[PDB]
Design a protein around this ligand. Structure first.
Ligand code: FES
Ligand code: FES
Length: 92
């Protein structure tokens, strides 16, 4: 598939709703971060979003740099110098 790209360099906090299905953007191209807007498909990247169903209602931080080791969640990899020096829209 295409390489993923860094969409942003800070996570987005979202209130997840128990029982609701979400589609995390894995490719970095969505203009509705942190979730998929179909860009993965329209641009024929070969990538597709990480579908997940929230088990509890709570605030979470979803990854926008797309380099987390625990997708879909922010694990602080964005805090590395590698990500903070990256250019948005480019691969890490
Ligand atoms: S827009 Fe990125 S995974 Fe769909
Ligand atoms: S935004 Fe990607 S690890 Fe924090």
């Amino acid at each position: 598939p295409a390489r993923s790209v860094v969409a942003l360099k800070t996570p987005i906090k979202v209130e997840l709703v128990a029982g609701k299905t979400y589609r995390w953007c894995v490719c970095g191209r969505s203009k509705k971060q942190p979730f998929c807007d179909g860009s993965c498909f329209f641009q024929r990247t070969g990538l597709s979003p990480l579908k997940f169903k929230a088990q509890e209602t709570r605030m979470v931080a979803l990854c926008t740099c797309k380099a987390t080791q625990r997708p879909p969640y922010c694990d602080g990899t964005c805090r590395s110098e590698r990500v903070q020096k990256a250019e948005v829209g480019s691969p890490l």
